[PDB]
Write a protein that binds this ligand. Structure first.
Ligand SMILES: [Mg+2]
Ligand SMILES: [Zn+2]
Lengths: 70, 137, 145, 199, 143, 63, 49, 67, 100
RNA sequence: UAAUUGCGAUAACGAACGAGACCUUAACCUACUAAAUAGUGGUGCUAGCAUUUGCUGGUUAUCCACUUCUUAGAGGGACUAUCGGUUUCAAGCCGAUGGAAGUUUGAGGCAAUAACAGGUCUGUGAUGCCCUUAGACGUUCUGGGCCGCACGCGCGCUACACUGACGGAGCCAGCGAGUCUAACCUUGGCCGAGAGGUCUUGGUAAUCUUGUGAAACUCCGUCGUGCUGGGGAUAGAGCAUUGUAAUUAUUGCUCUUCAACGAGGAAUUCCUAGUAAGCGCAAGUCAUCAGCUUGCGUUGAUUACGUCCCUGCCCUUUGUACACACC
């Protein structure tokens, strides 16, 4: 609750212009790059896995491996 | 014809018969062994010599006795030994040796069952060698 | 999962049934902060009230809160089994209750005070501050302060 | 190329494994060369493996540990903490996820990345408690680099959001690149700090 | 083209059979959902109340189709795992008998499973039919 | 950073109070015609190659 | 003169020494743990491992 | 260790003292002859005797041995 | 004629085989038909106990065993070749139960 | 060398006890033997799926043949085999090949002359002496105590969490035990949420529990890093079981407050490969009760292959006014 609890929409352009400067994307990577809290990521990454820039590497659970669009 | 394979206490009995590429493991196919990480440990004695390499044989294995990993190693040894025996008997021993060379040069107990059996535990401590904690004072 | 922008329709730590509730936690385990409801009781009542347990109190509702509270206050009438209640056959009426207030402490101290007024061994032990459920006192729970 | 199939339905993504230049199930193996000359004979690529779970004898003799796949040795080092004793399937899934993360970030042949990490984190001089500045065998270099990498991963992933797979990932990546921001390289440089002061 | 329960092993089979019990509309639920933990040695009920009984039905059906007659004690010992008994070492605890008994009775009423001449429950003819239906549907759906 | 590495050709014996260190007669890889004696902690055999930053420092027995 | 002693350690005794402690109630021995150690070979019980 | 005791070594020497125009330097055709010319009461001890006799007669072709 | 099953059980393997081999030749000398002698697995009756008759010393445990062995042979013969054959196996130490 | 194991040096030579050898068990044997109390195929009995006949299948009195897996008898097999390096001259050691097994092949049982004022008279209808013996220190009955709590110590169980908790899902062992004067192991139905109750059934046993459908573990989801949904100490209420008798809660089950614990100071224990550790199961103690022990298997590492820095022990030397032998 210390940071990025439920909304993170005052800077809602950073759900779009976030891919550059890091090629990786993960549940930990999102909470690491000072943007979002891990209380929503497991379903927030699903939006972009279904339609977006991130391609899954495997069928991982309890983990995340996504790569940028080539 | 029939072979067996063991790792610690599991035994996997394989029947190799003339047929059309049917590889059953528990009634399910070899693709559904479900260690989910040792699923490529059961493809070793096939991928090794030739990736497909075989539409003439049918391997029906049934494994009972150990644990998940022990039974996966048991089936991966049983299919290997079944292939070796079938080639030795029916196809030719030249080719059985030519695939035994690959099996032994990748040996992961495929042809020879591992000898490591559970060493008996001795009184005065959990485990065979580990002893209970002692206090002097 | 969906649009949760909700510029002014978010709720911070909030007010419910004598206890402040952290609206940043899923409703069941957040509500477990009320003294008298735990994990399973909160899960049962919140899946009876047909509220979504996958959300936090900051967005859930403003009336389902008091609805769930009333379900807690009248558990046996809203089709909840009797064995699911923490206080059954209370001491003098046979009914089955569930204390959810700054009242479980008062009911416990009332049980203790009657157990001391009766001059029972359990009451005497609670008076002396020692363990009461047949524990061994020779080695454990020495300082307790 | 060579789309041979048979009665048991398995996609030919695995039937294309060895007909060409051999690789892992996901990563090229022939692009593996150590950045040094001394840690050979103790790092054991080639033979290659399909999964780092070769449950074979490696502790009966003295110098047979060196002929164990380095990826499985790294898994065996994660095979630690007591809580994660056993759980070899857990540790091998962790290594698979870590190798995938290296594939994704600074791809650089992830297996080459981890072996380069080991080589760059192998302590070349230590101190014996007599503190005498003794030298370090290549085998001790290799397994102590593996231990340092794994324990840095462990106490990085402990009590924080990122999981053991990604902590192991960035630890190895930093060790391969040779930066002093990770735990393993800092500890190796600490061990080599007493190299001139105890000769 | 020759599909059985043993062509999809463990999870993609549920991923279609549970949806099949959803579509069937017959709930077969006795109302204990949201009230039971499904095992005496558990600490919580299933997270999602809707779906766990359908997955129990699918699993019981597949479990008695892969083998011969199966009894209530068998399913109890199977589905019941370890228990956090406190400051004591964990220990295998059997599962809740009532839920397995009622899922067996539900499969009875729906005709997926029948009685056996020696005791216990054996998969019925329409049970094998239905299980092969889900198997062959899943195989062509997602290999 | 000066560059030099060597290879143990003759392992002499154990050294150290507890028996952890081993003496090795090393043949240098560059300037091969030179046998220098060194001390090493880990297990070493013949035909093994060591990295030693300092090139000329005869490490002796550790009493 | 005597209350029921049909269960518990008081119900059984060593068939030889009648000691109520250490009793070997296995395979139908009903012998003391020391009296059995003494007369073990004579029953057919021996040491091999 | 793999050191042989006196009841191995002395019996082997006694066999080689009187059976040199006899069993060759091969263990398989050594133990067989031991079976019929020695009252060994255990196959493990027989194997020990025959192996040490094989070693003795293998090194006999490199110079005479003491005793 | 009557069909019977003989069960042979003992601790003494030597005399257990002394009867399991005597019975086969005593049925061959009358040229009967019989299912082969089946050897049920030996029950190892391992029993741990304390060497100490008291509670002093190093904790040292000692196990005992009475390994029990048992076999079974089925055949059919007339009543005289049943009784005169069950009167052959009286080897002291091997117990014989003949069921019909 | 594990060894007074051997080589060898040599007023010794030849030996004996111990060690070893031996026995038990654990590894192997497409070799012999024999098996609906073990298992496998093929004929009918067949329900699905596909239909050119095949996948999974049940067919516990339904057909034949067999012994690869299982079992247990007799045997076989390893003796560091062979080849190299090092061996003073050998004993041996070290590599590689092959081998099922190459560290005494792994683990045990047995364990010389002996010494302890080590423990046990509370195991004995073993027993000297002393004491007690009719208000008994004998035996028996009721009740309480052994468990009691300013505190110190040891053996342990559970944790501090994301390599994790929680839920569904996969469904993977071995060692055993289990009742005829009778209530033991319990399969299968119905009820309850659960412990548990209930109507039965099989098992005196490779036959039934039991395929002990064990646990850890594996898959997918909930949790999001919080003294938190980690941890379950403490206490409250209710239901059963065991027992003549649960109060000082035997135990199990349901709900509830949810303590310390942020990985541990000085110190300190165990251990070298199926071993440490993690995991549970069986048996013993049992009318009931494990956090205990004895065995067992599932998962399976790290480091080492050395040494006398510490401790312990042995041998040798050495001093003695000791010989009841430093009490
Ligand atoms: Mg006491
Ligand atoms: Zn006795």
């Amino acid at each position: 609750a210390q940071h990025a609890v439920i909304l993170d929409q005052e800077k809602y352009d950073r759900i779009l212009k976030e891919v550059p400067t890091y090629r990786y994307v993960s549940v930990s990577v999102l909470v690491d790059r000072l943007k979002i809290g891990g209380s929503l990521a497991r379903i927030a990454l699903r939006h972009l896995e279904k339609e977006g820039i991130i391609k899954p590497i495997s069928k991982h659970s309890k983990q995340a491996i996504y790569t940028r669009a080539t | 014809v029939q072979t067996f394979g063991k790792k610690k206490s599991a035994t996997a009995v394989a029947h190799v018969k003339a047929g059309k590429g049917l590889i059953k493991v528990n009634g399910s196919p070899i693709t559904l062994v479900e260690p989910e990480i040792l699923r490529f440990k059961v493809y070793e004695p096939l991928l090794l010599v030739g990736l497909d390499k075989f539409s003439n044989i049918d391997i029906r294995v049934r494994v009972t006795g150990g644990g998940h990993v022990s039974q996966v190693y048991a089936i991966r040894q049983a299919i290997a030994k079944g292939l070796v025996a079938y080639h030795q008997k029916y196809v030719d021993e030249q080719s059985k040796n030519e695939l035994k060379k690959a099996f032994t040069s990748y040996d992961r107990t495929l042809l020879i069952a591992d000898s490591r059996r559970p060493e008996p535990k001795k009184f005065g401590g959990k485990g065979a060698r580990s002893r209970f904690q002692k206090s002097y004072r | 999962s969906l649009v949760v922008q909700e510029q002014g329709s978010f709720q911070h730590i909030l007010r419910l049934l004598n206890t402040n509730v952290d609206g940043n936690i899923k409703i069941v385990y957040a509500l477990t902060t009320i003294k008298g409801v735990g994990r399973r009781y909160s899960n049962l009542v919140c899946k009876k009230a047909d509220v979504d347990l996958h959300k936090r109190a900051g967005e859930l509702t403003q009336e389902e809160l008091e609805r769930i509270v009333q379900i807690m206050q009248n558990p046996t009438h809203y089709k909840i089994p009797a064995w699911f209640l923490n206080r059954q056959n209370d001491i003098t009426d046979g009914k089955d209750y569930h204390t959810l207030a700054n009242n479980v402490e008062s009911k416990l101290r009332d049980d203790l005070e009657r157990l001391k007024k009766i001059r029972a061994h359990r009451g005497i032990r609670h008076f002396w501050g020692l363990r009461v459920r047949g524990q061994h006192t020779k080695t454990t729970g020495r300082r307790r302060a | 190329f060579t789309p041979v199939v048979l009665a048991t339905p398995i996609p030919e993504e695995v039937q294309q494994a060895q007909t060409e230049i051999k690789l892992f199930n996901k990563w090229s193996f022939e692009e593996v060369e150590v950045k040094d000359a001394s840690l050979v004979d103790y790092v054991q690529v080639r033979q290659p493996i399909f999964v780092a779970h070769t449950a074979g004898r490696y502790a009966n003799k003295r110098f047979r540990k060196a002929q164990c796949p380095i990826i499985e040795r790294l898994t065996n080092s994660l095979m630690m903490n007591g809580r994660n004793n056993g759980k070899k399937l857990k540790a091998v899934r962790i290594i698979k996820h870590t190798l995938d993360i290296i594939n994704v970030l600074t791809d650089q042949n992830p297996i080459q990345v981890v072996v380069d990490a080991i080589t760059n984190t192998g302590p070349r001089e230590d101190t014996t408690r007599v503190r005498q500045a003794v030298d370090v065998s290549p085998l001790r270099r290799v397994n102590q680099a593996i231990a340092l990498l794994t324990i840095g991963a462990r106490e990085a992933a402990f009590r924080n959001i990122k999981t053991i797979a990604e902590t192991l990932a960035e630890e190895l990546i930093n060790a391969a690149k040779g930066s002093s921001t990770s735990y393993a390289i800092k500890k190796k440089d600490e061990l080599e700090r007493v190299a001139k002061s105890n000769r | 083209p020759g599909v059985s329960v043993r062509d999809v092993a463990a999870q993609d089979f549920i991923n279609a059979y549970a949806s099949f019990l959803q579509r069937q509309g017959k709930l077969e639920v006795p109302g204990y959902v949201d009230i039971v933990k499904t095992s005496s040695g558990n600490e919580m009920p299933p997270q999602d109340a809707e779906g766990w009984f359908y997955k129990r039905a699918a699993s019981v059906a597949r479990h008695i189709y892969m083998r011969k007659q199966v009894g209530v004690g068998k399913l109890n010992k199977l589905y019941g795992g370890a228990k956090s008994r406190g400051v004591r070492p964990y220990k295998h605890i059997d599962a809740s008998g009532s839920i397995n008994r009622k899922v067996l009775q539900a499969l009875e009423k729906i005709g997926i499973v029948e009685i056996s001449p020696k005791g216990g429950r054996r998969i019925s003819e329409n049970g094998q039919r239905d299980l092969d239906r889900i198997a062959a549907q899943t195989l062509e759906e997602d290999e | 950073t000066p560059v030099t590495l060597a290879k143990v050709i003759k392992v002499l014996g154990r050294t150290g109070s507890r028996g952890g260190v081993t003496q090795v007669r090393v043949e240098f890889l560059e300037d091969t015609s030179r046998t220098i004696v060194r001390n090493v902690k880990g297990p070493v055999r013949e035909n093994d190659i060591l990295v030693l930053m300092e090139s000329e420092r005869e490490a002796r027995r550790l009493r | 003169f005597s209350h029921p002693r049909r269960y518990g350690k008081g119900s059984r005794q060593c068939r030889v020494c009648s000691s109520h402690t250490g009793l070997i109630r296995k395979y139908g021995l009903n012998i003391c743990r020391q009296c059995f150690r003494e007369k073990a070979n004579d029953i057919g019980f021996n040491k091999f491992r | 260790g793999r050191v042989r005791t006196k009841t191995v070594k002395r019996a082997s020497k006694a066999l080689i003292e009187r059976y040199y125009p006899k069993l060759t330097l091969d263990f398989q055709t050594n133990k067989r002859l031991c079976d019929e010319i020695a009252t060994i009461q255990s196959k493990r001890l027989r194997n020990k005797i025959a192996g040490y006799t094989t070693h003795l007669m293998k090194r006999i072709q490199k110079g005479p041995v003491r005793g | 004629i009557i069909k019977i099953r003989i069960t042979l059980t003992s601790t003494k393997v030597k005399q257990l085989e002394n009867v399991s081999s005597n019975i086969v030749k005593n049925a061959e000398q009358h040229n009967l038909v019989k299912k082969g002698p089946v050897r049920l697995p030996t029950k190892v009756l391992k029993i741990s106990t304390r060497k100490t008759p008291n509670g002093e010393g190093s904790k040292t445990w000692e196990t005992y065993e009475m390994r029990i062995h048992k076999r079974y042979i089925d055949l059919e013969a007339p009543v005289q070749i049943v009784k005169r054959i069950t009167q052959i196996t009286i080897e002291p130490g091997v117990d014989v139960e003949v069921v019909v």
